[PDB]
Amino acid sequence: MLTAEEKAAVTGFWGKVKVDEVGAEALGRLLVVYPWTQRFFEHFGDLSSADAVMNNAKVKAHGKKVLDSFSNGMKHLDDLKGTFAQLSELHCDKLHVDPENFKLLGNVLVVVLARHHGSEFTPLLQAEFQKVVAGVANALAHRYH
Amino acid sequence: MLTAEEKAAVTGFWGKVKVDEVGAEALGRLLVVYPWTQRFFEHFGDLSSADAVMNNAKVKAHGKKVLDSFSNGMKHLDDLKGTFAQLSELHCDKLHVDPENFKLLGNVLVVVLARHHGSEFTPLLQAEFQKVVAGVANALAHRYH
Amino acid sequence: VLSAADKSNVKAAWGKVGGNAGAYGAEALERMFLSFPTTKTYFPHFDLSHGSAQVKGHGEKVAAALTKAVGHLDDLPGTLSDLSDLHAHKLRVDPVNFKLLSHSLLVTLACHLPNDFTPAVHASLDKFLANVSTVLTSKYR
Amino acid sequence: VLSAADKSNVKAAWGKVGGNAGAYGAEALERMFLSFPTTKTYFPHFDLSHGSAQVKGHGEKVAAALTKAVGHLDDLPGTLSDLSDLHAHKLRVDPVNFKLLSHSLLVTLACHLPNDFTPAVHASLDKFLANVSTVLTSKYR
Numbered sequence: 001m002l003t004a005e006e007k008a009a010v011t012g013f014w015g016k017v018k019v020d021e022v023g024a025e026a027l028g029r030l031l032v033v034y035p036w037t038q039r040f041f042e043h044f045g046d047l048s049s050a051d052a053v054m055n056n057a058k059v060k061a062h063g064k065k066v067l068d069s070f071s072n073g074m075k076h077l078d079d080l081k082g083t084f085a086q087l088s089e090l091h092c093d094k095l096h097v098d099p100e101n102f103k104l105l106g107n108v109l110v111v112v113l114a115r116h117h118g119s120e121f122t123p124l125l126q127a128e129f130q131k132v133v134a135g136v137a138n139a140l141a142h143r144y145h
Numbered sequence: 146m147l148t149a150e151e152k153a154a155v156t157g158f159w160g161k162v163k164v165d166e167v168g169a170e171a172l173g174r175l176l177v178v179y180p181w182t183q184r185f186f187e188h189f190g191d192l193s194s195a196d197a198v199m200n201n202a203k204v205k206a207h208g209k210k211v212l213d214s215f216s217n218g219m220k221h222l223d224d225l226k227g228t229f230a231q232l233s234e235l236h237c238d239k240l241h242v243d244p245e246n247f248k249l250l251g252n253v254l255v256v257v258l259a260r261h262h263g264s265e266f267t268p269l270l271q272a273e274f275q276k277v278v279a280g281v282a283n284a285l286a287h288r289y290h
Numbered sequence: 291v292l293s294a295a296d297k298s299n300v301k302a303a304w305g306k307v308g309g310n311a312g313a314y315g316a317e318a319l320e321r322m323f324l325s326f327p328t329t330k331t332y333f334p335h336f337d338l339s340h341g342s343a344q345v346k347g348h349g350e351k352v353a354a355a356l357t358k359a360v361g362h363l364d365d366l367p368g369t370l371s372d373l374s375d376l377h378a379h380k381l382r383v384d385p386v387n388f389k390l391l392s393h394s395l396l397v398t399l400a401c402h403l404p405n406d407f408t409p410a411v412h413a414s415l416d417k418f419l420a421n422v423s424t425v426l427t428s429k430y431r
Numbered sequence: 432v433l434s435a436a437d438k439s440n441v442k443a444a445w446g447k448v449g450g451n452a453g454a455y456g457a458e459a460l461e462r463m464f465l466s467f468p469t470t471k472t473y474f475p476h477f478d479l480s481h482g483s484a485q486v487k488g489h490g491e492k493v494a495a496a497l498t499k500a501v502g503h504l505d506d507l508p509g510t511l512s513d514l515s516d517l518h519a520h521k522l523r524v525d526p527v528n529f530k531l532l533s534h535s536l537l538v539t540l541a542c543h544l545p546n547d548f549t550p551a552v553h554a555s556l557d558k559f560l561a562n563v564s565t566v567l568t569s570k571y572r
């Protein structure tokens with residue numbers, strides 16, 4: 001994964017991340033901004049506007065959950081793959097979410113991280129976090145092969 | 146990845162595969178069909194028109210060169226990380242090629258074989274190539290990740 | 291946006307597809323689903339065994355669909371739109387899939403027209419199908 | 432095409448962008464070279480090292496076009512059309528990168544304009560760039 005000096009950077013930084021609320025807004029931000037995504041989330045309720053989504057209570061709790069996986073992936077960078085085993089099965093082989101979309105969410109996450117933390121999330125941090133989401137793109141993708 | 150019936154199916158086929166002209170046609174094709182691939186093949190000569198690189202000698206020659214290196218791994222479908230370790234390297238740190246183009250030439254090769262083989266190259270058949278081309282691809286992309 | 295060669299290529303090729311289209315669109319999909327399984331969730335209704343006249347009657351209006359688009363090459367924006375909205379607003383089809391269909395369609399023309407599938411053709415038709423996909427996404431709302 | 436609501440939403444957000452167009456240009460520029468190293472290859476003659484003369488020129492020339500785009504949205508086909516000639520025949524940029532700058536911007540806005548960067552706005556800058564991007568890649572096809 002990452003030069004252990006690099007790890008200490010993605011790590012020292014998650015320390016100050018309010019995973020909860022990033023979580024809500026991430027999934028929302030994705031749902032609003034990559035409409036097709038919705039389709040997999042249509043048991044959630046009404047997602048017909050911005051507000052619909054950003055407000056919807058389901059979106060919110062399903063987001064705390066989806067940063068948890070990260071907050072969690074973070075603990076175990078060195079073997080993302082393994083740590084992700086199950087979720088990787090869940091998405092691929094009975095949800096059937098094309099892996100392009102682990103990226104998209106990957107990225108939106110970044111975008112929400114940059115909003116939360118300003119120019120404090122420098123590009124040297126971000127260059128890091130973008131592997132972290134590239135890698136969490138990689139573990140969730142696996143069972144496609 | 147590759148069931149007992151799969152791992153053979155392909156190589157009983159591959160056996161009848163004219164490995165040599167395919168690559169030269171495959172190649173000009175990535176090149177004719179997808180102009181932005183020409184940046185890396187600058188120093189190759191006239192490419193300015195399909196004819197050019199449908200008859201360009203280095204193309205012709207790098208076509209096969211690739212295929213061998215392809216068709217060797219066709220015979221190695223267990224360890225591709227391995228077979229393609231320092232091809233993955235040349236293509237990442239050196240040539241610096243965006244992983245998608247793998248998947249391009251990939252597909253493209255599949256079209257090649259499916260011109261050379263007609264009705265004979267069934268939906269069964271290629272469905273199996275799909276995850277070889279794609280197989281070979283994450284291999285070539287490893288020494289980024 | 292295209293050429294004149296291009297259009298003259300799409301055409302001839304698709305005239306040498308001709309009355310096959312329906313039987314080819316057919317094939318298109320079978321390869322598609324069979325190669326990239328995740329295209330089968332867009333059809334939970336479908337019988338997906340070889341032949342299923344569900345499949346067959348579909349490969350058609352895809353081919354009737356395209357035949358319409360080959361015809362109106364000089365303006366795909368308009369003639370298609372009706373189809374675009376559906377494939378997005380309704381269906382909500384992760385744009386990624388049209389890459390997987392184009393390719394299938396070709397591989398399908400690929401063994402059905404070798405002494406026809408010269409580079410420039412493969413360059414034109416792909417290129418064509420690019421615009422078709424890039425219409426059926428035009429409405430990314 | 433872009434919904435009226437979006438159109439309005441850029442102008443605002445990029446209105447904010449203000450006299451800062453070409454700092455944010457150099458900032459998206461540089462977030463992209465690190466988080467996507469590959470993309471450096473296209474910019475060989477540079478001295479990429481932080482805050483480098485020439486990146487800052489690119490910083491601004493880019494962001495100035497974007498600006499000119501934010502001008503006439505109804506015709507992005509045309510007011511960028513010169514750049515589509517360059518970016519594809521002279522440079523030949525692999526499309527993938529276009530997203531990567533896109534993404535680069537999206538962030539950079541957020542780093543500096545949290546409060547304007549609402550979701551319906553983020554949705555918007557994007558639909559704008561995805562827009563932008565295609566224009567810049569018309570000629571591959």
Ligand code: HEM
Nearest residue numbers: 037040041065066069070087095097101102105106136140
């Ligand atoms: C890297 C990104 C993702 C991570 C880390 C992730 C992780 C998770 C987690 C922790 C759960 C809950 C486990 C459970 O309830 O069984 C879940 C469920 C789910 N995920 Fe994601 N997921 C990701 C991306 C996606 C994407 C992109 C989609 C759709 C495009 C998606 C669709 C779903 C659905 C439909 C469920 C179940 C919803 C439900 O139970 O009501 N996931 N995923």
Ligand code: HEM
Nearest residue numbers: 182185186210211212214215232236240242246247250251
């Ligand atoms: C699809 C599977 C691919 C295979 C099997 C493959 C294989 C190879 C091989 C075997 C070599 C020769 C190694 C040597 O120098 O001794 C090579 C070099 C090279 N590869 Fe590929 N490669 C693939 C994909 C690509 C793609 C997609 C591109 C760009 C679009 C690319 C660009 C190049 C270039 C520019 C060279 C150096 C040739 C020269 O000296 O001009 N490769 N590759």
Ligand code: HEM
Nearest residue numbers: 329332333351352355356373381383387388391392422423
């Ligand atoms: C080459 C581009 C495509 C064309 C020309 C096309 C054409 C059409 C047409 C005309 C219809 C409905 C009309 C009728 O039944 O009378 C339709 C329906 C549909 N298409 Fe395709 N489509 C394309 C791409 C795709 C792709 C890539 C997918 C997913 C992989 C897809 C999945 C569907 C679905 C889920 C429906 C509605 C289900 C139904 O008919 O019962 N389409 N398409």
Ligand code: HEM
Nearest residue numbers: 470473474492493494496497514522524528529532533563
């Ligand atoms: C938002 C997308 C982009 C915009 C708005 C944009 C804007 C511009 C403009 C207006 C120019 C010309 C300035 C001049 O005439 O000297 C330029 C030059 C150039 N662009 Fe882009 N660009 C974009 C994306 C990209 C990307 C992603 C790459 C590659 C990663 C790229 C590669 C280049 C190169 C190599 C030059 C030549 C500069 C030189 O060598 O002097 N462009 N860009």
